[PDB]
């Protein structure tokens, strides 16, 4: 029932290159829908799902200019951070930013987000009150003061409660069957004779969206983490995901082992075992 929008923004300086590379990716409900890249021939925001082609040229021209402004902002900030951290020239540096908003089922604002990282590390973030800032690093305190002085929190709070909600409402009405979909995991168990006396049961879940999923094993019982290996969830490359979890077992006595697959698309958790 819930929904979100995110812009994920990155600028990267490298030793020789005159200007940094700036990339911005927007997401509705965790699916990419727009992108800008300053390396591109003639950089602009481009649609990244078919449902975004409804927006006319005035939408794209404005978004592109916002992107060019952000790239100017990341450029100056990268420069200022260099000085804040007494870093000299000839290094590589990263600045990243995360977006704005989460709605509940009723489409009202649950939370606003605004976070920045330098060299992949928390630099500064707007707290959930959308009024105060968290900055851990001694160097970050300079930004925190400057931003407290100029009422930056108010600007970002207005975006987060206003445009971010309004435009997410609009986007959700526009791609109504493209993002109101979940694919269920089809699950199966495979068998692998391993050094004698023992064997690995591998529980597979395939073809599912979104990524969040859990695979458990029970020894007829209630729990197994003692040599339960798994893999991190992985993209298949077609928009669906894949995961397995495995458990080591006595050969012969494998018919009392049960795998459970928990996914939001399921009516109830899947249950299956090795089927010879």
């Amino acid at each position: 029932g819930p929904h979100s929008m995110r812009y994920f923004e990155t600028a990267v300086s490298r030793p020789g290159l005159e200007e940094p590379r700036y990339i911005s990716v927007g997401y509705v409900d965790n699916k990419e829908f727009v992108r800008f890249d300053s390396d591109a021939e003639n950089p602009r925001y481009e649609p990244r799902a078919p449902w975004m082609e409804q927006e006319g040229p005035e939408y794209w021209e404005r978004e592109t200019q916002k992107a060019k402004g952000q790239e100017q902002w990341f450029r100056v900030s990268l420069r200022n951070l260099l000085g804040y951290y007494n870093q000299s020239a000839g290094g590589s540096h990263t600045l990243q930013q995360m977006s704005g908003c989460d709605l509940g089922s009723d489409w009202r604002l649950l939370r606003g987000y605004l976070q920045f990282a330098y060299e992949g590390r928390d630099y500064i973030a707007l707290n959930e009150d959308l009024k105060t800032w968290t900055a851990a690093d001694m160097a970050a305190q300079i930004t925190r003061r400057k931003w407290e002085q100029s009422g930056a929190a108010e600007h970002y709070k207005a975006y987060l409660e206003g445009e971010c909600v309004e435009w997410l409402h609009r986007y959700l009405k526009n791609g109504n069957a493209t993002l109101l979909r979940t694919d269920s995991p089809k699950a199966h168990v495979t068998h692998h004779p391993r050094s004698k006396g023992e064997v690995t049961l591998r529980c597979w879940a395939l073809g599912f969206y979104p990524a969040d999923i859990t695979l458990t094993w029970q020894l007829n019982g209630e729990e197994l983490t003692q040599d339960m290996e798994l893999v991190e969830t992985r993209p298949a490359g077609d928009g669906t995901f894949q995961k397995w979890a495995s458990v080591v077992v006595p050969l012969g006595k494998e018919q009392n082992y049960t795998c459970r697959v928990y996914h939001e698309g399921l009516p109830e958790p899947l249950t299956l075992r090795w089927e010879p």
Binding site: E63, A67, Q70, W73, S77, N80, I124, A152, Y159, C164
Partner: peptide, 9 residues
């Protein structure tokens, strides 16, 4: 709809 940032760092 993209955010524009306020003051630089």
């Amino acid at each position: 709809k993209a955010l524009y940032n306020f003051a630089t760092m």
